[PDB]
Amino acid sequence: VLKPMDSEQLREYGHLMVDFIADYYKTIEDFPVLSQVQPGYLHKLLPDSAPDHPETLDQVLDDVRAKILPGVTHWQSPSFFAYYPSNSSVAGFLGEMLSAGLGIVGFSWVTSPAATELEMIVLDWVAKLLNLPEQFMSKGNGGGVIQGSASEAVLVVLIAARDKVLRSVGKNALEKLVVYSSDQTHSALQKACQIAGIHPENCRVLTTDSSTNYALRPESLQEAVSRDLEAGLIPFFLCANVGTTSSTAVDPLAALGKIANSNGIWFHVDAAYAGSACICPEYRQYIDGVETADSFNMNAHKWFLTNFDCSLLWVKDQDSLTLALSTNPLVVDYKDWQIPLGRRFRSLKLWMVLRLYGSETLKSYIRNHIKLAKEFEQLVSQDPNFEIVTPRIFALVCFRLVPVKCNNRNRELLDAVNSSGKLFMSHTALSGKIVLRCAIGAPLTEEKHVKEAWKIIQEEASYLLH
Amino acid sequence: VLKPMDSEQLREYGHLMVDFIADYYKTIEDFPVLSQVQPGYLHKLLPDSAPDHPETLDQVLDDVRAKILPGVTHWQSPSFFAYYPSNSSVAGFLGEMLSAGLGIVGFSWVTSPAATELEMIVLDWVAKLLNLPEQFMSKGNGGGVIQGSASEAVLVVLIAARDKVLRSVGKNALEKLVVYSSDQTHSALQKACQIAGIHPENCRVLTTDSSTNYALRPESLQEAVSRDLEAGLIPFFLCANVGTTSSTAVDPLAALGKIANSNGIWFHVDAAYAGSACICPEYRQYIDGVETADSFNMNAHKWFLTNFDCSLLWVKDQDSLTLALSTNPEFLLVVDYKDWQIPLGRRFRSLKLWMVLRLYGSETLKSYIRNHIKLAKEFEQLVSQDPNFEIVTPRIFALVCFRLVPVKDECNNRNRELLDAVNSSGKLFMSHTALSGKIVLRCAIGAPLTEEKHVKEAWKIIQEEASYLLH
Numbered sequence: 002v003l004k005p006m007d008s009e010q011l012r013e014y015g016h017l018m019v020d021f022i023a024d025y026y027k028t029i030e031d032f033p034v035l036s037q038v039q040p041g042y043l044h045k046l047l048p049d050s051a052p053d054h055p056e057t058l059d060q061v062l063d064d065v066r067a068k069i070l071p072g073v074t075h076w077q078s079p080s081f082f083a084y085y086p087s088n089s090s091v092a093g094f095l096g097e098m099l100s101a102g103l104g105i106v107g108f109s110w111v112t113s114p115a116a117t118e119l120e121m122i123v124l125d126w127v128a129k130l131l132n133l134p135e136q137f138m139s140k141g142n143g144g145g146v147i148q149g150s151a152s153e154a155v156l157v158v159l160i161a162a163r164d165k166v167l168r169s170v171g172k173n174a175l176e177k178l179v180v181y182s183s184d185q186t187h188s189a190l191q192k193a194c195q196i197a198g199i200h201p202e203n204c205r206v207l208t209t210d211s212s213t214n215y216a217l218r219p220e221s222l223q224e225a226v227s228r229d230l231e232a233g234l235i236p237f238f239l240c241a242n243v244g245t246t247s248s249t250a251v252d253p254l255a256a257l258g259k260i261a262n263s264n265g266i267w268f269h270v271d272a273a274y275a276g277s278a279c280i281c282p283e284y285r286q287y288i289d290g291v292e293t294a295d296s297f298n299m300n301a302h303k304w305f306l307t308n309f310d311c312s313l314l315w316v317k318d319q320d321s322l323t324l325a326l327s328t329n330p331l332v333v334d335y336k337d338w339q340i341p342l343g344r345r346f347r348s349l350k351l352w353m354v355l356r357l358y359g360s361e362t363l364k365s366y367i368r369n370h371i372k373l374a375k376e377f378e379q380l381v382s383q384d385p386n387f388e389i390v391t392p393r394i395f396a397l398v399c400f401r402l403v404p405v406k407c408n409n410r411n412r413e414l415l416d417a418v419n420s421s422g423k424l425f426m427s428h429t430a431l432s433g434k435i436v437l438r439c440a441i442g443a444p445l446t447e448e449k450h451v452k453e454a455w456k457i458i459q460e461e462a463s464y465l466l467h
Numbered sequence: 468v469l470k471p472m473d474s475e476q477l478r479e480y481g482h483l484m485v486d487f488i489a490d491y492y493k494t495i496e497d498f499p500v501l502s503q504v505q506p507g508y509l510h511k512l513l514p515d516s517a518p519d520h521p522e523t524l525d526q527v528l529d530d531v532r533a534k535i536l537p538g539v540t541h542w543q544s545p546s547f548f549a550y551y552p553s554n555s556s557v558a559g560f561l562g563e564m565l566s567a568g569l570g571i572v573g574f575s576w577v578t579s580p581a582a583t584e585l586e587m588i589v590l591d592w593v594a595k596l597l598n599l600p601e602q603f604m605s606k607g608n609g610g611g612v613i614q615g616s617a618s619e620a621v622l623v624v625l626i627a628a629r630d631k632v633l634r635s636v637g638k639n640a641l642e643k644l645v646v647y648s649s650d651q652t653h654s655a656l657q658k659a660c661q662i663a664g665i666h667p668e669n670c671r672v673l674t675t676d677s678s679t680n681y682a683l684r685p686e687s688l689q690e691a692v693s694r695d696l697e698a699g700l701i702p703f704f705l706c707a708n709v710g711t712t713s714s715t716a717v718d719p720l721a722a723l724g725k726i727a728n729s730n731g732i733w734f735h736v737d738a739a740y741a742g743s744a745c746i747c748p749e750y751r752q753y754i755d756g757v758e759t760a761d762s763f764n765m766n767a768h769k770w771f772l773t774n775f776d777c778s779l780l781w782v783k784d785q786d787s788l789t790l791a792l793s794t795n796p797e798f799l800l801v802v803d804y805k806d807w808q809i810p811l812g813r814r815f816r817s818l819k820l821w822m823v824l825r826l827y828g829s830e831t832l833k834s835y836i837r838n839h840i841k842l843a844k845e846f847e848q849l850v851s852q853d854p855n856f857e858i859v860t861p862r863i864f865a866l867v868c869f870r871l872v873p874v875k876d877e878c879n880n881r882n883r884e885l886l887d888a889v890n891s892s893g894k895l896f897m898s899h900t901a902l903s904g905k906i907v908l909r910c911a912i913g914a915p916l917t918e919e920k921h922v923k924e925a926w927k928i929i930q931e932e933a934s935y936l937l938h
């Protein structure tokens with residue numbers, strides 16, 4: 002009989018669960034990547050009440066196989082090419098295991114000093130791998146913190162910026178604060194603006210087009226800022242993207258940051274996905290200008306082999322955060338850097354990734370995925386029925402069927418491909434027209450899977466065309 | 468050489484890690500409960516750069532033993548009596564394992580239908596164990612959702628209420644919105660008010676005292692609301708506590724909710740810790756009146772054996788949440804939990820709750836709560852038998868509030884010194900609070916490993932330390 006806690010039961014049952022998960026990974030290719038169940042399928046398979054008496058672990062695992070797994074979209078499949086990767090690694094899995102086993106909640110330094118200091122140290126490590134400027138290192142006025150997601154990271158710095166303005170001019174000025182970003186910016190910014198009370202008409206979504214590969218034009222930011230200043234409004238927050246979700250566009254951080262600095266605009270850089278690549282010198286160029294940023298954000302749980310959740314946020318003045326987020330009327334108390342109070346030992350998995358793989362292995366991994374994406378881009382360019390929509394900079398390839406009413410052949414192709422169960426890809430829209438995406442990021446993906454995916458896409462397009 | 472992903476390497480290394488964690492649990496009593504290290508000790512022990520080449524798992528585990536574990540405050544020690552428990556169970560540990568192994572992110576139904584539907588189902592399961600009214604079941608207009616923490620949950624419903632008011636009266640009315648709570652309410656409410664733009668002067672922290680056992684007096688809420696209405700302010704949010712962090716005080720939900728309903732005040736019930744106990748019929752009484760609440764929150768990762776993170780939030784109208792938190796301009800089907808929370812992504816957290824519920828059973832969960840409450844009752848008796856101490860507030864659950872009685876020796880308040888000596892002994896860990904301005908020591912029995920032997924030993928150590936301090 003299983004007890005609430007017992008070291009030996011934990012050992013036995015944990016070995017069983019380890020074997021189960023390993024078997025899952027060993028046969029992951031046997032599942033349809035995108036789940037094919039119907040909405041509501043699960044409530045008929047499970048009781049509508051918890052059991053009075055315990056049920057076996059074998060029964061739970063059988064229910065996982067037969068009831069839960071059919072309803073899973075396999076993010077770790079070697080043929081998962083959708084959205085952006087959400088990496089799971091052996092090192093990160095071991096880190097999550099250890100974090101759950103320790104079971105500590107580190108609000109404040111005392112409730113596990115190691116949980117705070119290891120986080121400080123590994124954020125420093127990653128900042129050094131990224132060649133971030135000195136203002137983002139813990140030894141200065143700034144520092145780093147692990148957030149639950151890039152959405153929370155942007156909310157935190159937006160609140161910090163808002164409050165820096167409001168406690169100098171008064172809360173009645175909320176109606177005048179303006180946020181700036183390009184029309185490629187992730188929806189997390191709009192949601193943070195809503196939560197923070199920014200007025201909708203003061204969310205400046207600046208237009209971009211193909212002439213700049215959907216990168217924000219600095220001159221349009223300057224014009225918008227000057228028109229807002231003339232109108233008595235207070236520009237206060239700017240979000241630049243390094244690797245947008247749609248087409249992996251990259252904004253010019255230098256000129257945008259010069260504008261933001263000159264006008265007292267908090268400068269946030271969202272490199273949630275592509276930031277990982279910037280540990281490679283041939284891609285570090287793409288965050289040039291970050292020295293002007295007040296904050297910088299990269300998702301280690303995307304393309305850095307660190308199991309969700311692990312969003313990394315650096316700021317150049319931690320006081321802005323803690324003055325906004327503290328509730329109180331020498332050492333870091335991380336509750337004052339985040340929305341939640343409690344937090345788990347999330348730095349362990351990042352530390353274990355860094356140690357067990359090495360910067361060299363992480364670089365080679367980034368490069369291998371980019372090489373696979375370049376092979377896919379080559380395959381696309383050789384087929385006259387397809388076209389590359391925007392230049393490929395990292396491991397994301399945007400493409401589409403060449404134009405030849407009411408029906409959208411690109412969506413039909415994507416639906417048929419995803420329904421095959423052999424792979425999973427997602428779509429976006431650029432300048433109003435649909436765009437198919439192939440984002441290579443799963444650790445299991447090999448060139449064989451990319452080749453088979455291209456063959457499947459070709460066969461499906463040919464069948465639909467006839 | 469270790470690969471980014473490999474089923475057999477994962478199998479071998481995961482077995483090694485399972486043995487490591489089991490060894491930690493078997494010997495957890497050998498460590499000082501409260502960490503005794505100095506701030507900054509760790510950066511001197513570790514390199515200042517990530518390594519160029521991989522390091523062995525044995526060296527990593529040895530560093531965990533020798534460098535990290537001393538810097539750990541052992542929340543799962545059977546002698547951890549501080550703040551409130553943050554339970555770790557075999558079931559919850561297995562659920563965390565499976566969640567990490569599958570590695571899904573279910574921000575939308577499509578990106579793993581089971582991750583959404585199992586959550587709906589298990590929130591329904593717990594709602595039935597709590598005998599929550601039907602308005603909170605997923606089949607109606609309301610529903611349940613797993614949040615990362617009670618702080619996030621209260622922020623979410625405060626946002627929903629604020630936007631519901633503002634899109635009716637206009638955003639310029641933000642300066643008039645009033646939030647109400649007692650002076651025992653967790654700081655999460657204040658932090659949410661700050662994030663949400665509530666003006667500081669419009670946060671009514673209403674005083675409580677021993678006459679009601681620090682429970683909020685409804686008449687004072689009524690007075691505050693009438694005075695605010697007469698002054699042109701818009702009451703819009705009320706937070707009632709079921710189990711305050713200080714003294715496990717319980718607010719009268721029925722009369723407070725009567726007032727809130729009558730005045731259009733969003734009624735939130737924070738039962739973060741004590742909500743668990745309410746699966747027992749002898750404690751369900753303490754959330755009577757929740758039927759008037761617009762939202763209700765219980766932390767499964769506190770006292771319900773569900774490894775962090777797992778905060779359970781129920782609402783009676785999911786549309787409030789989704790209309791406030793959705794980013795779609797035209798969308799008015801299926802549940803997309805991104806629209807119920809702050810983050811976009813979310814992991815498969817319903818797995819650990821499902822497994823706790825299935826592998827233990829409601830009967831075992833009830834007995835577990837009751838065992839912790841009985842241990843707290845024994846500790847209370849032990850304190851009451853020592854004349855140098857006193858019970859400060861009645862014990863309702865597994866938290867005992869006590870203190871050394873001040874004595875005029877030829878005046879002094881030893882309690883902070885006693886707590887510091889006890890915590891520095893390393894044999895146990897407890898925290899303090901303040902009631903009506905005077906310091907109060909706390910003993911919150913909540914760790915799954917805690918037995919009566921540990922409670923007795925903790926009391927004996929406290930007595931010895933107080934005896935040393937008195938002379």
Ligand SMILES: N[C@@H](Cc1ccccc1)C(=O)O
Pocket residue numbers: 083084085086087246303572574811812
């Ligand atoms: N932001 C990604 C989805 C995603 C969310 C969270 C983690 C990983 C991926 C997209 O819109 O394509």
Ligand SMILES: N[C@@H](Cc1ccccc1)C(=O)O
Pocket residue numbers: 106108342343550551552553712769
């Ligand atoms: N309630 C505790 C914080 C806490 C967090 C998580 C678990 C238990 C307790 C406090 O007020 O300090």
